[PDB]
Write a protein that holds these residues in place. Structure first.
Motif, short mmCIF file in Angstrom:
data_model
loop_
_atom_site.label_atom_id
_atom_site.label_comp_id
_atom_site.label_asym_id
_atom_site.label_seq_id
_atom_site.Cartn_x
_atom_site.Cartn_y
_atom_site.Cartn_z
N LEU B 1 56.20 52.71 45.54
CA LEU B 1 57.13 52.35 44.21
C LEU B 1 57.27 53.47 43.14
CD1 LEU B 1 58.60 49.70 43.01
CD2 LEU B 1 56.38 49.07 41.81
N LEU B 2 58.57 54.16 43.13
CA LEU B 2 58.69 55.07 42.11
C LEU B 2 58.99 54.91 40.74
CD1 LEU B 2 60.68 57.28 44.92
CD2 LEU B 2 58.35 56.12 45.15
N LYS B 3 59.78 53.73 40.59
CA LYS B 3 60.34 53.46 39.25
C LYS B 3 60.80 51.89 39.48
CE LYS B 3 64.10 54.72 37.55
NZ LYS B 3 65.35 55.43 37.15
N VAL B 4 60.29 50.90 38.67
CA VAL B 4 61.20 49.77 38.75
C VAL B 4 62.17 49.79 37.53
CG1 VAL B 4 59.43 48.02 39.68
CG2 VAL B 4 58.86 49.02 37.54
N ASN B 5 63.40 49.04 38.02
CA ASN B 5 64.68 48.94 37.24
C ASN B 5 64.68 47.80 36.41
OD1 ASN B 5 65.97 51.23 38.04
ND2 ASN B 5 66.80 50.23 39.85
N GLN B 6 65.65 47.72 35.41
CA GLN B 6 65.69 46.67 34.60
C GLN B 6 66.11 45.21 35.46
OE1 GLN B 6 68.05 49.51 34.15
NE2 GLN B 6 68.13 49.88 31.93
N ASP B 7 67.11 45.59 36.33
CA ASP B 7 67.55 44.39 37.17
C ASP B 7 66.82 43.94 38.63
OD1 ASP B 7 68.74 47.22 37.21
OD2 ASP B 7 69.38 46.68 39.14
N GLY B 8 65.44 43.94 38.17
CA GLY B 8 64.73 43.35 39.44
C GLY B 8 64.59 44.06 40.42
N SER B 9 65.45 45.06 40.56
CA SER B 9 65.46 45.94 41.71
C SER B 9 64.17 46.84 42.02
CB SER B 9 66.77 46.91 42.00
OG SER B 9 66.32 47.93 41.09
N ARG B 10 63.55 46.87 43.09
CA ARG B 10 62.54 47.82 43.29
C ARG B 10 63.08 49.21 43.67
NH1 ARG B 10 57.02 45.13 45.68
NH2 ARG B 10 58.67 44.68 47.33
N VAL B 11 62.72 50.41 43.22
CA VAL B 11 63.13 51.61 43.77
C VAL B 11 61.80 52.25 44.64
CG1 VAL B 11 64.34 53.98 43.36
CG2 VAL B 11 64.19 52.28 41.81
N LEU B 12 62.25 52.13 46.10
CA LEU B 12 60.87 52.33 47.09
C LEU B 12 60.90 53.82 47.16
CD1 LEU B 12 60.46 49.53 49.36
CD2 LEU B 12 59.08 50.17 47.29
#
Lengths: 50, 50
Positions: B1-12
């Motif tokens: 996990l690199l950064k969690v967005n506002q919109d519930g999306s995970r950035v893997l």
């Protein structure tokens, strides 16, 4: 002083540049040459111009 | 996990880059009669018996 230290460390260095046409290159790639980035200081001058 | 967005999306990582079991380095490639091969190149120690 601490700032002077930092400054000098920062503006004066060699840095891991890398390579154009690195390995592995893309199929057919045909130009291969090195990157040159920040180079360490030479003069008494370049140290004033910090 | 690199950064969690506002919109519930995970950035893997999976997303941000391609990931593979690969060569530590892709400089050197070896072929034995055209068939692909990898090799061992033994250089003799100073003075020991061949």
């Amino acid at each position: 002083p601490v700032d002077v230290i930092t400054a000098i460390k920062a503006q004066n260095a060699q840095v891991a540049a890398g390579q154009l046409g690195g390995t592995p290159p893309v199929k057919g790639q045909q130009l291969n040459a090195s990157i040159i980035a920040q180079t360490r200081l030479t003069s008494t001058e370049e140290f004033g111009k910090i | 996990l690199l950064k969690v967005n506002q919109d519930g999306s995970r950035v893997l990582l999976r997303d941000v880059a391609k990931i593979e079991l690969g060569g530590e380095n892709y400089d050197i490639i070896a072929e034995f009669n055209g068939q692909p091969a990898s090799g061992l190149g033994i250089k003799l120690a100073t003075g020991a018996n061949a």
